[PDB]
Design a protein around this ligand. Structure first.
Ligand SMILES: CCCCCCCC/C=C\CCCCCCCC(=O)O[C@H](COC(=O)CCCCCCC/C=C/CCCCCCCC)COP(=O)(O)OCCN
Lengths: 140, 258, 258, 145, 144, 144, 131
């Protein structure tokens, strides 16, 4: 026939072309959602990667701010493959190259012979360094 | 509710059977018995009016877009010391977005409108109905050689559009305005790389060749056999292909180029 | 050979010269004469639907596809210096110099250019132009004159819709997706564009491209043979001759003004 | 008339739910949906490349915009207008404003520095502790002479 | 025939609303202002890369442009013109003329300095000026 | 006619072949892959190294970089690199430095040789590695 | 009319050669030398060698020898410049910010240029300022 033979082919063909766009648009492993506290994030924003040793290990979800302290907070996420960090781990904001995007860095200190889990906060941090206060304190 | 306000009808059942009619038109024209020696003179005959005759509007128009890419790439880089990177703008534009998209719009205009008019005139004069009567399938006789001709022509016509458009930028960039040829080709040869500019230019040229040929062969097959149905399907071929080439251009750039 | 090659090339030289002679006499006999502003007033609004209103669907949904591709390709190559204050230039500047009136003209010659050719050619095959001049005023100033003025108004108006949507289409891959501090997106993009360089100069290209597209679209439908194959042959030649007249005059207007 | 009752109406509910996209500048956040902001004032000596719609940030988080830049006809000093939202109210009188640059094409923004406690700022006050922008012509000339 | 007249009115309305998206949001051409300005005269010795339509400034906020830059063929001194509007007509006679640069890779503009009083009017010259920065002399004086 | 269709197909395939050779010669492709051996080295900060990073000894590229791995115990960046079979005579005293191509270009894994002589083979480590220093500790060490 | 068709055939061919002559107008041996540079930097093939400032030749393909691992910086100076003394040298100068560099007895055939001045990389140049 012409009515029944061509109605079920359009159901499967439209569902296959629409599902091919769902995979192609990148719409497809747990973390423990660390939190930090800085004073000058600089050029940090959402979907910014976090790195250690030069290669990236995760991304930053969003940057919030508490109205009682008025300091920027980071909601970065590092995966389960790297957990053994001490409480003296320094956080530093570094720039990829010269004029690239900014990223966080984990300066691992000397471990004393605690681990960070859900709800912890990195104590020792170092914020981004702007180029305004360095030249004003050097050529003066 | 039963009237045309909410349940207006003829929009979920209609324009969905045409998707099923287009799926059965391509499946019955590509899956069958292997006939290599039979379709061997049919592929060469249908390559003249698809690939050879469409080469006229690409060579003379490749230097038109290739020269204005060098005119607009000069005055915007004066205060940035990017005069030695003159091939940085011409080669990267004609290998990523310009090229396989602009040639597909010329393929849908010339070869896309001719393939709709060819099959539409066969159904108006009942040539496909008389061919079907003499114990042979009209699907794997005239549609199947026209599909494989349009698939292999558009990547073979994109590389002509790239090389002419790069040479079109060399006639306005190297010859005119006094730019060194050693500084021009050094921004093209060892600046851009493989698998981002060369392979991806040929990946999207194949998918654009399938989508344009499938639309142009469906409007010529699913049409009204009269003098006004061929002219209506010729207009709808350019509309459905311009929204499919430019529509998939945002879809295909999700994986590649960051 | 001397009497054969010169006779074959001489036969095509007169036929090319007689082609432009019939196009000049068709436009001159359709614009001058007695003023008929009260009779063509219901005829101009009737021809503004299939030229301007029906061609708005091919521009609006394709306008967000141009800016999303151009906004995504023009971002990742600008992150090496500064992510902020980008995408205001190289998107709005490109959509007012080369993109815009060229890209909308290929959509006007494919949708409205191929429809106005097939409309006059269908009336010539059904003996409607010869029947109008045998009893009333000749159809050079009755059906060709409202169709020529409708193309020189809609295409300058549809280019403004193509620019403003494509600017907003470029503001979707920069805002709410890999954001670049969109307060910096404004109050510096306005400093790059100005009058008589980007705004008025875009309107100069729109009026020139509207004349050379509607002239061939109204001549191929008027000079076609009254048969079923002559309308489909003139529909293919409309997209060919308009693509060489838009991209051909793109090098003319760029070297003159810019 | 038999199949156009519920097999077609599932396409209307699927197209209506997919008819919404993200729009922060088309018709949602520009005019109708906004945040309550109070107007502040600050008198500077040199703003550099400061223009309209510039973010005022405390450390990097954008808390407001800049409306316009006006000049007083008596002393000829640039007076900027702040757009700090009502979500951040505890601002003391010892707060300082610093014009810092971000980029290479002369794009400067206002980096607000909060103070330590005073009085809570209200709608229509003026902050006195303002710092001028950095200029490269006085930066290199101070090193030589 | 009513369908072919309403949709044209929306087409001219959508084409008009697209014009306000360019003339207001994408550019600032909403006012002509009938050019309420008056020109002056100035003389430098090395303007550097000062081109036409150079925006002069007082404290960072941009007002007034530069119309014509000419070279006086008497002692090879360039002559520039400044075109501030007729609003801030209180300029002291001790005002200087310095050539500055917007950041690092921006355009080279002119910064007006406030001095300590002859009010300048239409058709006079500024005596005290200051040249731009020369890149070849700083590297020569740094090692000298 | 019939003979016009057969000849013009071969000219179309020849024009597409010469246009493809213009991309194979005057574009990113310059030539028209022998198996290498895999090294291992531990660093402290690789900077902006990614896949297919060029490894060069003096400037001539001798291989690429396959992947960037990490240590699940000490958390140090371990980079894998490949040298060709022709460049086999390399001593153990080799400084693995990470430099950039120019100033704003991509980083390349530099390598220099240094004169009971043990040479490097397939599957050994390098103890002398020079980590890529970030922009933060250059100005901070210059002031302090 | 067949007589008027062949009369205009030679008139269009006279204008075809005039219109093509303005487009074709706008569309020497090289003796090789030798150089023993150590650090070539970001210098590659087809680089403009301008000794004094005006270009004299190009650079061939570079490769490392298996003996001492040293790149070959052989050059393609043409015949119009031949009165160069033997007491000359070459220096690697950069141009721009992307890393594209350029260069700056008798030398007719087989000339080994002495007094090599390699390209000083900025990654090692900062160690002298810091230490
Ligand atoms: C910081 C200042 C930056 C410059 C600001 C001013 C720029 C002004 C540019 C606009 C005017 C010229 C426009 C020229 C035409 C552009 C059109 C174009 O680019 O192609 C677009 C799409 O864009 C592309 O083709 C992708 C281009 C990719 C460019 C890759 C980078 C090029 C590098 C050049 C700069 C070099 C960077 C090195 C640093 C040195 C200089 C700072 C076509 O889109 P389609 O959808 O295919 O159209 C279909 C219908 N025709």
């Amino acid at each position: 026939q012409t009515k029944k033979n061509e109605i079920w082919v359009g159901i499967f063909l439209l569902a296959a072309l629409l599902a091919a766009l769902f995979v192609c648009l990148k719409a497809a492993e747990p973390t423990y959602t660390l939190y930090a506290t800085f004073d000058n994030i600089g050029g940090l924003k959402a979907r910014s990667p976090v790195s250690i040793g030069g290669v990236v290990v995760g991304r930053v979800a969003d940057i919030t701010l508490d109205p009682k302290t008025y300091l920027p907070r980071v909601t970065l996420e590092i995966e389960q493959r790297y957990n053994h960090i001490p409480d003296t781990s320094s956080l530093s904001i570094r720039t990829s190259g010269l004029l690239g995007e900014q990223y966080l860095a984990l300066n691992v200190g000397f471990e004393d012979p605690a681990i960070l889990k859900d709800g912890d906060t990195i104590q020792d941090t170092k914020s981004a360094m702007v180029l305004e206060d360095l030249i004003g304190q050097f050529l003066y | 509710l039963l009237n045309a306000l909410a349940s207006l009808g003829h929009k979920g059942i209609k324009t969905l059977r045409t998707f099923g009619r287009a799926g059965l038109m391509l499946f019955n024209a590509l899956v069958g018995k292997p006939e290599f020696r039979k379709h061997a003179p049919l592929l060469v005959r249908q390559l003249y009016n698809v690939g050879v005759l469409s080469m006229l509007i690409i060579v003379v128009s490749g230097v038109f877009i290739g020269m204005v890419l060098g005119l607009q790439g000069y005055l915007v880089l004066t205060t940035y010391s990017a005069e030695t990177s003159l091939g940085m703008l011409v080669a990267l534009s004609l290998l990523r977005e310009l090229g396989p998209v602009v040639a597909a719009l010329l393929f849908a205009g010339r070869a896309g409108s001719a393939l709709t008019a060819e099959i539409g005139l066969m159904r108006a004069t009942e040539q496909l109905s008389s061919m079907e009567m003499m114990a042979v399938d009209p699907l794997r006789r005239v549609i199947s050689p026209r599909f494989w001709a349009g698939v292999i022509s558009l990547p073979l016509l994109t590389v002509i559009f790239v090389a002419v458009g790069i040479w079109g930028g060399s006639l306005v960039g190297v010859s005119w305005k006094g730019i060194d040829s050693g500084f021009f080709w050094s921004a093209m040869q060892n600046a851009v790389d493989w698998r981002m500019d060369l392979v991806n230019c040929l990946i999207k040229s194949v998918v654009f060749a399938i989508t344009v040929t499938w639309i142009s062969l469906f409007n010529g097959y699913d049409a009204i056999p009269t003098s006004a149905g061929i002219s209506r399907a010729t207009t709808r071929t350019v509309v459905h292909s311009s929204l499919a080439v430019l529509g998939l251009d945002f879809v295909l750039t999700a994986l590649m180029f960051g």
